[PDB]
Amino acid sequence: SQIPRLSAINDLHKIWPTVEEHGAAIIESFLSLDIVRRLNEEVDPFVKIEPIPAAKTKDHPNHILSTTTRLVNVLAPISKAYREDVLNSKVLHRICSDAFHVYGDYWVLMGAVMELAPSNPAQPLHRDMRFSHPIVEYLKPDAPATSINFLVALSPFTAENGATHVILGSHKWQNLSNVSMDATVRALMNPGDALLITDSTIHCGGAETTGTETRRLLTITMGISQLTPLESNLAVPRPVIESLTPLAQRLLGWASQRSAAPRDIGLLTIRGNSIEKTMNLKAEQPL
Amino acid sequence: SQIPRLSAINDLHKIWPTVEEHGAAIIESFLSLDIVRRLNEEVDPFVKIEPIPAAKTKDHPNHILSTTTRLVNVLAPISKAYREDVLNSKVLHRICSDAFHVYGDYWVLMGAVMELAPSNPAQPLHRDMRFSHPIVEYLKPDAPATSINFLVALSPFTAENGATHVILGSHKWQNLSNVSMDATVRALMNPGDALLITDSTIHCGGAETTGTETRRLLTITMGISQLTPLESNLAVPRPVIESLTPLAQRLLGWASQRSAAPRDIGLLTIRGNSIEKTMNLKAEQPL
Ligand SMILES: CN1C(=O)c2ccccc2NC(=O)/C1=C/c1ccccc1
Ligand SMILES: CN1C(=O)c2ccccc2NC(=O)/C1=C/c1ccccc1
Ligand SMILES: [Br-]
Ligand SMILES: [Br-]
Ligand SMILES: [Cl-]
Ligand SMILES: [Cl-]
Ligand code: NI
Ligand code: NI
Numbered sequence: 001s002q003i004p005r006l007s008a009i010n011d012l013h014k015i016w017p018t019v020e021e022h023g024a025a026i027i028e029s030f031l032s033l034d035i036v037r038r039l040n041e042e043v044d045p046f047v048k049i050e051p052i053p054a055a056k057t058k059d060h061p062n063h064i065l066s067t068t069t070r071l072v073n074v075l076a077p078i079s080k081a082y083r084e085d086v087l088n089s090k091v092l093h094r095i096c097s098d099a100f101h102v103y104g105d106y107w108v109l110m111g112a113v114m115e116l117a118p119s120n121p122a123q124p125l126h127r128d129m130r131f132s133h134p135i136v137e138y139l140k141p142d143a144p145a146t147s148i149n150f151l152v153a154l155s156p157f158t159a160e161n162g163a164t165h166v167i168l169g170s171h172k173w174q175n176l177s178n179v180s181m182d183a184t185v186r187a188l189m190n191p192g193d194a195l196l197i198t199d200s201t202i203h204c205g206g207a208e209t210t211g212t213e214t215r216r217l218l219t220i221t222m223g224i225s226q227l228t229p230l231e232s233n234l235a236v237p238r239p240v241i242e243s244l245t246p247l248a249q250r251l252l253g254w255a256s257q258r259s260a261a262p263r264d265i266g267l268l269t270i271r272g273n274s275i276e277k278t279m280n281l282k283a284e285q286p287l
Numbered sequence: 288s289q290i291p292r293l294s295a296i297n298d299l300h301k302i303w304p305t306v307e308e309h310g311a312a313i314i315e316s317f318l319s320l321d322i323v324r325r326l327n328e329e330v331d332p333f334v335k336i337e338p339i340p341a342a343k344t345k346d347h348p349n350h351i352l353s354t355t356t357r358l359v360n361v362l363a364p365i366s367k368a369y370r371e372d373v374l375n376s377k378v379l380h381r382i383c384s385d386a387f388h389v390y391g392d393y394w395v396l397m398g399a400v401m402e403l404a405p406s407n408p409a410q411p412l413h414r415d416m417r418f419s420h421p422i423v424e425y426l427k428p429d430a431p432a433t434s435i436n437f438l439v440a441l442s443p444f445t446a447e448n449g450a451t452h453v454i455l456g457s458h459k460w461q462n463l464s465n466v467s468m469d470a471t472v473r474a475l476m477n478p479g480d481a482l483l484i485t486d487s488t489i490h491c492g493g494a495e496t497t498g499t500e501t502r503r504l505l506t507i508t509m510g511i512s513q514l515t516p517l518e519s520n521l522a523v524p525r526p527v528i529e530s531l532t533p534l535a536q537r538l539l540g541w542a543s544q545r546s547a548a549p550r551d552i553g554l555l556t557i558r559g560n561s562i563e564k565t566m567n568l569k570a571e572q573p574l
Binding site: 050051053055058059060061062063064071072073074102103104130131132133134135136138139140143144146202224225226227228229230231234235254256257259260261263264265266268269270271272273274275277279280 | 306337338340342345346347348349350351358359360361389390417418419420421422425426427430431433511512513514515516517518519521522541543544546547548550551552553554555556557558559560561562564565566
């Protein structure tokens with residue numbers, strides 16, 4: 001049986017319950033083709049200049065991604081489409097509040113464009129967050145997901161060009177002795193479609209077999225505000241931050257956060273007041 | 288049997304193993320009387336002006352602390368003694384690296400001065416982190432502590448003036464039906480002594496019974512860099528940050544962090560580079 005497909009607009013209330021059950025769901029038209037085109041245009045040059053993941057020039061090398069992979073994070077200052085349209089997506093926020101209501105506020109752990117060159121090999125079958133958040137390995141087996149990953153297609157995903165593999169139900173597996181490429185199904189997607197998985201869903205990038213096709217995706221890891229993001233927005237110029245909505249500012253860590261505890265005392269506060277009140281942080285100030 | 292007492296200097300290697308076993312240990316002369324006096328002097332006026340914890344002026348009210356309690360956090364910009372001496376304490380860093388090596392880097396979740404007025408009632412017996420980090424309630428029972436709390440005496444702790452109660456062994460309790468003030472022992476301390484507990488140690492502030500004594504403490508919650516701090520240093524002026532050591536800057540969240548994962552990809556990074564490299568962040572620049 002295949003990955004369930006849901007309409008971003010008509011099936012909005014079914015998306016999280018479907019992922020909680022099956023560990024994966026494909027959201028059709030998660031982003032419009034306009035947003036996809038504007039995103040591709042704004043990030044294009046940054047993909048071209050990006051060194052290899054484990055470049056000796058970096059003090060935080062990624063030794064896991066293949067040398068024919070380019071990853072570009074901290075998209076807020078590069079892309080107006082990302083910081084305005086993607087960060088304020090009504091679909092993303094309904095799914096995240098459905099998923100994370102038991103914990104409280106959520107933010108972006110990483111928003112990155114990944115481009116995978118022709119003849120890129122299949123990734124090993126894995127769960128996300130194991131190279132950054134060892135704490136998630138100590139959660140009780142039946143603990144609600146603390147992070148989820150929107151894999152948004154910025155180019156076509158096909159069986160031939162290395163569409164994502166997932167194992168349905170694998171987010172509930174404790175015994176991993178049935179893990180095999182034989183147990184997987186493929187996330188076939190048009191640009192703007194998104195594959196939504198949890199931090200427990202076993203998956204991998206597929207093998208590029210055409211030898212000519214370049215595959216590109218926008219990976220948005222959304223997590224509870226209690227977990228530290230993989231990326232920092234500390235160096236994002238303040239005029240850019242002040243052009244965002246209050247909601248977008250919170251997702252980038254430029255606001256105080258709240259837990260779901262009945263008498264929550266909050267996160268990233270300043271003597272009982274918020275970051276935004278303290279710094280007198282402006283919102284929606286056009287550049 | 289009483290809370291074990293250890294010398295900051297001669298018993299340094301025994302401090303964490305003692306806490307891991309008993310759930311509490313008193314560190315004699317954790318801070319020198321010089322540092323204690325300079326800290327008290329620099330924070331004095333900020334204690335006097337601080338409103339009630341649940342003041343209607345605050346957008347993050349603390350509804351749990353008694354109205355005869357004052358709490359002041361974000362100490363870096365107030366106190367030179369805190370930002371230079373306390374943040375670079377060789378004792379604190381040996382204990383934290385002993386406690387958190389399985390997880391990776393650690394930082395300050397909150398450094399606060401608490402002052403409790405005459406006739407302040409005893410707090411209810413509790414574990415810390417339940418009003419900010421509901422995620423810790425979902426960790427496996429035998430998961431290593433993700434945060435620890437140094438309760439540093441800034442004034443004398445006596446049975447009469449409301450010295451902390453702890454239940455020894457309570458950090459390993461799953462059944463909480465033996466929780467009673469009858470099961471507790473007291474943390475009797477001179478200024479500069481510290482009571483070290485885990486996030487699982489059941490404890491409470493004692494009742495002030497003299498009706499004249501004001502009790503003051505410096506509470507430093509140290510946690511794995513994977514957990515979000517209760518306080519923010521985002522608004523701390525950059526000249527102050529650039530006067531700190533590289534280690535102190537990391538503890539305040541003004542640097543990238545690393546997990547203990549063999550091929551760690553890191554936390555708060557910028558396209559494979561650190562905050563400090565990216566922003567060209569200076570260190571130990573005197574004001
Ligand atoms: C290493 N690695 C990443 O870099 C990565 C990239 C984008 C988004 C999340 C992310 N986190 C990971 O856990 C990850 C998994 C992974 C595992 C196996 C093979 C290749 C990747
Ligand atoms: C509410 N509360 C705090 O404010 C607090 C204060 C200082 C340091 C940590 C801290 N975190 C807590 O979990 C906390 C516990 C607590 C429980 C019961 C009674 C009074 C306090
Ligand atoms: Br993929
Ligand atoms: Br106390
Ligand atoms: Cl890869
Ligand atoms: Cl109190
Ligand atoms: Ni993955
Ligand atoms: Ni406490």
